[PDB]
Write a protein that binds this ligand. Structure first.
Ligand code: HEM
Ligand code: HEM
Lengths: 361, 362
């Protein structure tokens, strides 16, 4: 029903993946360090209430008639819904408050990549809040109300709703399918592998930035799918793109989805073969992305795709090498990166006295 | 996760209990060949039968001819029906084609201008629509996508709307949802079991004057933006005066329970419930079935939220038109703006495995 908010790491990275996503990036409007820290403390107090399913402050109602309610109220009567709130700090934050020398070296700016068509307005951001929950209205309410508490100190830069499986009807032991119809998530880091989390995901003290110990680095890519084109490709082109069959998700030449792949039996530019850690010196990622469908553009086409999210111990040794290796991906015919951002995700809130970003400020 | 039956005297997705998710699509017809269009309708009915039962369209999502693209795009494979319903409607601009002029119902009236109307002509109108409602949004998207695929060349998508969450109720025995303004929405609606209220207020009847419409309904859709910034700085008393009900329980002003009957004269003269209530509109009654939406930011540092409002009624001229006309002085107007609009005639149900969408019209 609820995920614990306190811990060594922030929840919502290695904790079980919830049904829905509302991702928002904020820009900071204050120059005042104190004002900003005060906001971080207020945000943490509100996150505590929200993740336990209570209203922020003095509730959505029953207060002074002459005052606006503390909480906007649209979550009353709903359950915590495994809601998690994960905050991240973007590179541009460290140009404020005199933090320029505390920017972690692992929070590297992404290269320009072949094919990039990055929409400036839907990229970047001084900080982000990732709201995950099984009920989309719980997630929205959270973002809605943090934006409200921050008004005059932050604004919403861009926002993205997303969805994965629906846990009210499908088994937790069944891989969800992306909007291209293929199983997505088969060969991923799972939250149970604390050994691979420690090696590939969490910032370690001796990494170079002590305030980030227990943190992680997040890469967000908004990836449009050319759906009508994909849907016109033969079943064989589709399976050739990935190196797995569509019905079962088995690596080509194999029988069950979870059979370990034989890379030489795949086409040289098949996605799985180019993404595999064996093709990238061991580089391994934790994918935690969500599908999106926003509507339709002015040409009739479905404005849909994958809001790709990756956690990694170092952006330099995680996302950049693998993405670089996709230069020739057969899938590139069918997708387009149109938004991008990177964030440093601080360690967890240890107890009821701690706050978001305490190690940095 | 059960299925909702597709056959009936009426189309599902109207009096049916309100599912969590919506994907709504308006289509324009790009063929002039009437026989082309009827075959479309027949092929779509057959896909619909599979889709509502949790089955793949045509010959399935895989295991077909390798050189050929699959019949079903496959992103619903291994998912339950999820109470998917598919409801089709014909917009007034459709009867300009195929020699249907004299068949347009009288009850499908174009809507007049309303004060404050700021209607985007792109996200308005449509030759026909499909309302897809499901508890899983992947299921709802998959249906729309596949329907539009089957219709490549005979129809294209003029505009769509996804509702991430319901703000309506047809089952008063279950909790009333809240809209993005924080109020319960749907308390005094028409319930799917109130058959006599549905017959009186929702289903078109034979003597109404358009026979092929017997058993159908008429749909009004309004895309309504909410000025949430303005709303969120209003006092709690102001928010309660706008509606006539308190925020917490959702009870009419001065009473204690959500479902106690509102006593209209204790509400402000311009309170929403006071003005929308049937007794203020000579009995006019609507079946509300709308959904919340949010379409990113506004590029001004704020979230972009609204309500995709849908009303089914027996006659547009006696349902939505008079009630919306009485809302000219509604206190709510200060916080909302109508920015999209369309009306549709929703035909009778597909009666059996041999029938098809629109058979009574064609
Ligand atoms: C629209 C965008 C994308 C789609 C539809 C897609 C799809 C898939 C599919 C179907 C699989 C096989 C099942 C699985 O293990 O998840 C896969 C695997 C994988 N993908 Fe992607 N992908 C996309 C973008 C990316 C990007 C941008 C990256 C990295 C920058 C990436 C990295 C990986 C990795 C590391 C694997 C696991 C490979 C293995 O170890 O077997 N993917 N992807
Ligand atoms: C953003 C726009 C709107 C919002 C937020 C909203 C909200 C509400 C709320 C909170 C109620 C009271 C609870 C209930 O009984 O359902 C209500 C009732 C009602 N509304 Fe609205 N509403 C909106 C637009 C409209 C429109 C456009 C119409 C008709 C054109 C309408 C017609 C009604 C009716 C008929 C009732 C039932 C009143 C009764 O008989 O007691 N509403 N609405």
């Amino acid at each position: 029903s609820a995920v614990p908010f306190h811990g060594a790491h922030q929840a919502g990275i290695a904790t079980p993946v919830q049904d829905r996503l509302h991702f928002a990036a904020f820009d900071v409007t204050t120059e005042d360090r104190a004002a900003f820290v005060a906001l971080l403390k207020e945000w943490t107090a509100a996150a505590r209430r929200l993740t336990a399913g209570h209203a922020v402050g003095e509730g959505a109602y029953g207060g002074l008639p002459e005052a606006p309610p503390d909480d906007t109220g649209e979550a009353l009567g709903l359950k915590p819904s495994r809601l998690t709130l994960t905050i991240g700090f973007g590179p541009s934050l460290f140009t404020r408050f005199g933090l320029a020398d505390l920017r972690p070296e692992a929070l590297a700016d992404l290269p320009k990549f072949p094919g990039d068509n990055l929409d400036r307005a839907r990229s970047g951001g001084d900080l982000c809040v990732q709201a995950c929950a099984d009920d989309p209205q719980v997630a929205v309410h959270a973002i809605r109300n943090l934006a409200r508490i921050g008004f005059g100190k932050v604004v919403v830069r861009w926002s993205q709703l997303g969805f994965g499986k629906t846990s009210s009807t499908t088994p937790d032991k069944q891989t969800p399918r992306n909007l291209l119809g293929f199983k997505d998530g088969t060969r991923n880091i799972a939250g149970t592998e604390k050994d691979r989390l420690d090696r590939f995901v969490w910032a370690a003290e001796k990494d170079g930035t002590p305030w980030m110990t227990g943190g992680s680095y997040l890469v967000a890519r908004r990836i449009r799918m050319h759906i009508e084109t994909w849907d016109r490709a033969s079943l064989q082109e589709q399976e050739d793109v990935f190196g797995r069959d569509k019905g079962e998700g088995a690596p080509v030449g194999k029988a069950k989805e979870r059979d370990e792949p034989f890379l030489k039996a795949m086409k040289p530019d098949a996605h799985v073969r180019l993404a595999h850690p064996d093709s990238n010196g061991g580089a391994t990622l934790l994918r935690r992305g969500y599908s999106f469908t926003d509507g339709t553009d002015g040409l009739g086409r479905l404005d849909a795709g994958l809001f790709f999210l990756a956690y990694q111990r170092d952006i330099r040794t995680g996302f950049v090498p693998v993405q670089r290796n996709l230069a020739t991906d057969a899938l590139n015919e069918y997708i387009q990166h149109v938004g991008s951002a990177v964030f440093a995700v601080p360690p967890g809130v240890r107890d009821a006295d701690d706050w978001w970003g305490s190690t940095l400020f």
